[model samples]
Target: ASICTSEEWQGLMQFTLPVRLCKEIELFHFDIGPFENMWPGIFVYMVHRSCGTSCFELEKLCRFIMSVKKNYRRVPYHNWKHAVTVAHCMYAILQNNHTLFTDLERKGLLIACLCHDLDHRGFSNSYLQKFDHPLAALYSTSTMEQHHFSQTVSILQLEGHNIFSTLSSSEYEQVLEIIRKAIIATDLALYFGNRKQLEEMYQTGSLNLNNQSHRDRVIGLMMTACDLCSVTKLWPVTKLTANDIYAEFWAEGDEMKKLGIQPIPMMDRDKKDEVPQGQLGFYNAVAIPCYTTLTQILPPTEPLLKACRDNLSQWEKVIR
Candidate 1:
């Protein structure tokens, strides 16, 4: 509801009415009410791709996310939508090539990836710091990363987040461990070592799905893959995301103004063009390559390789 305007929301209702939605993702639809463009089918497909088993079924996860949505005004950018997307993308990666992962490790990787960003606030690294968010206080070193890890655990404790409630105690503990490490790695700051470690681990056959050797590397790459999904999306979607961010940036500033705080970066008129561009370059040069390598790791993303294909595809690739 908060994610869209009345008119746009109305259009979304009309759009999905006749659209096909799998039963698994349609669980408890009214429980969360209507969220414009927020489709659970896609979310379930994502987790199913990751978990690799009925341990956490699509219908259960869908119900959980919907329940959480109804309880909170906003779940942040790294909320349920982001988590499920990564899970699905990871599922896509391994399913594209079974030779890459062992069944157990794949299961671990998928579960970890799915639970990694359980409760994310929409802020990037710097924004959270500037606001002196509570996460920054409780988590000292690499504060951002620490808080990310902490929150993933915290959210799972939320009443509705008990999707793993059906698991055996031992099995649940092991999967939870993997989820902790993977969620912490989502911090973009660790990209260099994170990327290298993943490549090295998978370079040997030991880490392939057959052996389950490098679970860390598997989750790391998958987590990054999920973060990079937007840019790697086709040009139409990619362009839309870029435009959406701009809108969000200004809207964020409006909220800050009500609090008597000066707008930062995109919210400030002078920095509008430059700030978003600065952010864009980071995604293109760094995030893209990281995910491009990741696509190789998980074959399912090959179709996404053409995301924004070329200049004519959209010189509008966000000049910011």
Candidate 2:
């Protein structure tokens, strides 16, 4: 009740009324763009509808959502908008295959996706290391991810911010563990290993969705896929997203030049001509393989892979 006034609540309800019927529209398609200030309402609608409103109080959930949004810095990428996009992607995926995950797992996944890049400093993990950022020392690998998880925990510790307050101690611990693993899995370094194992399982026909370990791996893969869902968007959307990412990367490159270190071609502003080739390399090495394997396992996710391929062709034309 204290989270918002009656008038504010009425406005939020009015704005999010359509989101409640998102499934009837193209929510699963690549048509959903960033909705600026309406994300919190959309997020609340997604969670309330999917996870059920019985598990959390409206006031606490609203507090938690506001806190999470407040924590995200205004970075060129990895900002609150990216967080909402990833969460929305996860929501779409779950809507397509709700039987694949438990309700608790869905709750954890959505929260983890929202908080995955909390307090990002607009630098990659490697940049953190090279710049001797304290976060690098704190976590030798997955530096930002570890920090993001810690920040998530910190938010829960804040008064009136624990959305999972109704859970038992054991259930709470399990949710935190899920959040930790899901947040960490967003790191591409971990994705490589996880993808290889999942691929081997798929090839040998041993990929059992019911097995706990297999389910864990699948959740990790979904985390990576959702995190990189930008490539699976419409051409103009994907193009703008790519520009934001390269802007952040090039900013880091500018910083490196001041430090007397040469950035890689993808990060170097001086090598802007190589951007298309770099994107092609990214699609071939990462995005294509990611969505391809995801589509193989979850046929409903084929749209993402198809959109990715379309974007790849667009990149090819630019190179030509």
Candidate 3:
């Protein structure tokens, strides 16, 4: 079945939003309904603007995006809205930092962000491994992250969904490799390793953005930075988003109960109050160190670092 009528497709193609590119990263809010509504169009615009001749099949591209949205599971935190939020973060990052990544890198990063969490099941990789699921055996390390990338490839293989069909064969393969690396890099375990390598480079003054290998590692960190964006939002947005995350985690815990397995305390709704401390630990362990190193290399990312601390302070009030 078709996703939209010819008339609807025309309207979507003509769609344009007021999002500023390469100007300001603080222009969008994650919790606003209207902003989510605007994000699909923004994604389409970004793809066409960056992919250039590769995404010229406008109608097919729109259908591909719609299908991607449809395929996103209705899980509480990993739904289509979360996908868009990650993409918006990538867009914001690219807008703030010019000359840091090549045009193709920016395009690949944006697409990778949008598709990284497709088909998520509201459970962590460790949960799957504990259950001895097939995916755990298949990936062995980045279980869910690997499955997410595989699902992304499956979606692209659908009829009328190969939006990158117009690219030269070599460029197409390279773009797919970039997307694969970017998606898998979103796993928090991988993030810590990438951060350590990047921090060493930065501390040693050997962080050369001009070097392709160094830049790829930084872009991988950027994926982690964007995926863990809740703490970097304003307090209202952060609170609501945090609630959604716990809701998803709690739902997964409820499922584990069906098998007579008790979930972790953080996933147990009865211990909901423990979230602030857990969030604080996540901030200190991953968010602060990740953004602090990112800002050290790319000074334009200070706002992300600042917003992260602001949210941490709010959580401290909970401690008092």
Candidate 4:
């Protein structure tokens, strides 16, 4: 099967191999998550775009379409459910402040968010360490983050699963670079500090914001924001979102217990006493900070950010 599309014409999403790849990343990141999340972002985007003033074209749709015979399981937090949620948030961030970034940058932001956790194994870094899996081998054993990044890249290359079939050779490289950085940033181990640095750059005007680099910075910020978007989600949604994260954490903890290894924070939570606030503590300190950062950058999300903080506060009080 041809990885690149067969048509010779430039078409609706005309670009070199690399551009198509970058585009595919947004649509196909679902491949990294469980089979369920494989195309939710693209599906939603297409639905909105087609139904609107733009003409509908199925040719451009293959990037996000699923293989009929595909068989897949859920990747804990990175399943289709999370993909849709992240995509929705990214879309909201972009639309709410449409004039702030360019078209390509906006698309990249949404795509980067969609692909952030392509194939996370429900467990965090600590969980993967106990299992002694290949990721542990390749990632060199710090957090499970390196392992997750490797696995995500592997999923992208699975047989019959090269989602960037729309790209040309040169264009493929460009897409790969952007997607790699975007997905790798979700490693948690790597991103938190980098984000702070970027923010600092913005504050001190150390970060250049000319016509060329500004869009990329915006994309980076939006991607970072949307990935952490769970915090700014509506109250009803926040509760469910919290559970999803906790479930992944606990499942990983289960594996660690099975291996007779020290249980990571949420994974080892055998009883309420195992940890005071349980996973809620981590969410409050880690997740909330990320979301709070995003809200500060994107003002439209200020209200949503407040809701997140309020939700976390409520949970912290009740759980204790």
Candidate 5:
């Protein structure tokens, strides 16, 4: 029997995702909640479709995905669902503009998106540093990102979990590094600098894909664009996701109160009324510019920019 007949392969194929759902998964405005039960399948299908099944064993890929799912904690926002959504955004972006990236780069980007927030503890890096969490000590900046990458590495080390095991030593390292940089690029603190660099290159018309540095910066921008893609989602999904994010933030705020440390307005439960304005501020400062620049680079992503603008206006209406 071929590998397709194996139990692991059969397990992954138990539930057949709908044809329409498959089509919608490639769109920017897909609502992921309805298909929660089929997240693993969606993930597998995305990997198989995007990266192709030729480079990796089917069973090992399934095992790797199962391991990734297991590593995500039960947090309000930074959990498996968020990871899958971000990865889906990456997949959608790739579907829209695959010509810009090489095959290996595409594989690395999707893997990085899926594993970027693994084992997230539902707190920002500032919260960890303020509370003197061990993770804060491990890395001075981008602490959680570093930890996420470490966890990704740990999963890769697990027997039967190395999905890239078929690659040569050099190709393996290249992919690994790509994954690392993409994961770290998800950190918002690093995003501003990366955005500025990209913006400068864009304005000067010097953003050449052939240059290694320019390509790396573009990859960084893509990671941030996908990471913040929630703002570009349909209104209901965007609102629901924002609530989940604030729920996580308020939980951290509750912890701060117990320790006699005050939280910011966005994090403080008492300041809930300010959420709309807070969201507007975030939209204008981060989401709008991020998507604007992304669309500039990849014109196919203009829908994402338009959705972001639509959501921004929605927030404006909310504040009124």
Candidate 6:
């Protein structure tokens, strides 16, 4: 019932009708170049590449995706560019293991990645609670994560942006419910819990995907994997991403100081010299464990494990 405004229609029309998205990367290899120009098309390509684009309403879907991109805050990190990179990582993972996730799971997983960081305000959950930001009380805990999911739903509800309107009511309900959990899974806080449970299942040799609960844990882990995908890229790409995040972190630290509060070591610009070692610690403590576990379950993912370690070597050399 809704049509794009003449101006909005022009925005959508800039892309050719029956849009054929450019292949931004060689499949299964890291492209790692300047991706800003290709970001929007690549997202459309990811959705298409994951599970056939024709099944969804193209006009509605394209417009919705563009609007969603517009909604991301202009922060140094956690912007639309970051969201596309995460989604691209998931897209590549899905391509690498077409048989691993059911079509339904893949759909939920990719869409969740696309929307996981919606409306991020460039502040940490710790800072939010410490300053008693309104959202802290609203969510109590996992504050930023819950807000992100809520913002996702709000965007979907907007006129001309309900791309899921074509889905059967039941299908839409099921996918949205999965999206809710998957977005929350992007909170690294949930990663520790998911990893512990996956570890137990790994030891027992009982990670039965047929079981819905086990599948939920896997989806949660997949979200974390995409959230931290930058750490698993080739060295040059990883360094670029690391620098962007620390720049964002240091900027936030400046804000904290202005408010008469102390910032964490990583965010504190005074401790900037520590970043190389910080990268090493993150790769060793977090990225390696996460990618190694994923590779065990999905062998095609071994490349991610390899890339993380290779990048870790570069970090170690830089530290010395």
lDDT by residue for model 5 over 210-313, one digit each (tens)?
99888888889899988998898889989989989988999999999998999999889999898999999999999999988898888998999999999999
The alpha-carbon lDDT assigned to residue 14 of candidate 5 equals 63
lDDT of 4: 0.52
State the C-alpha lDDT per candidate: 0.55, 0.85, 0.79, 0.52, 0.88, 0.79
Is 1 or 3 the stronger prediction by lDDT? 3
Clashing pairs in 3: none
**Poorest lDDT segment (10 consecutive residues) of candidate 3:** 21-30
User: In terms of TM-score, how similar is model 2 to the real structure?
Assistant: 0.93
Residue-wise lDDT of candidate 1 within 1-320, one digit each (tens)? 11222343233223332244443223211111133355444444444544443746544455444543332325334555555555555666666665555555566556555555544455555556667877777765456557555554555565445667776798678767776666676777776687776667656643464444355665676677666666555455555555555655666676677778887666654466585466556556666567566656665655555552342235434552
Model 6 TM-score on a 0 to 1 scale: 0.92
Write model 4 residue lDDT over 282-308, tens digit each, in one string. Answer: 566666666665666666766555666
List the candidates ranked by TM-score, beginning with the highest: 5, 2, 6, 3, 4, 1
Error of 5 at 55 (Å): 2.8
Q: What is the TM-score of each candidate against the true structure?
A: 0.67, 0.93, 0.90, 0.68, 0.96, 0.92
lDDT (tens digit, per residue) of candidate 6 on 1-320 = 12334454345435442232344342443553465656666666677777786856777776767777877889988998888888878888888888878777777777788889888888888889988899999998789999988888887888777767877888899889899989988888878888888888987999888888888888788788888888777777777887789878988889999999889899899998888888788888788889877887778878778877888899899988
Winner on lDDT between 3 and 6 is 3
Query: What lDDT score is found at residue 95 in candidate 3?
Result: 69
RMSD of each: 7.4, 2.7, 2.8, 8.2, 3.3, 2.9
For 1-320, candidate 3 gives per-residue lDDT tens digits of: 22334554455677766756323324533333346656667678666555453545877767667767766887889988888878877777776785667766777788788889988888899789989988898999989999888987887787777767877899879889889999989998888879999999988999898888887898888898889887788898898898889989998888888889999987888888788888888888989998898889878878889999999999988877
Question: Is 1 or 5 the stronger prediction by TM-score?
Answer: 5
Once superposed on the true structure, which residue ranges of model 6 sit more than 4 Å away at CA? 1-33
In model 6, what is the error at residue 217, expressed in angstroms? 0.9
- Model 2, poorest ten-residue lDDT window? 1-10
TM-score of 5: 0.96
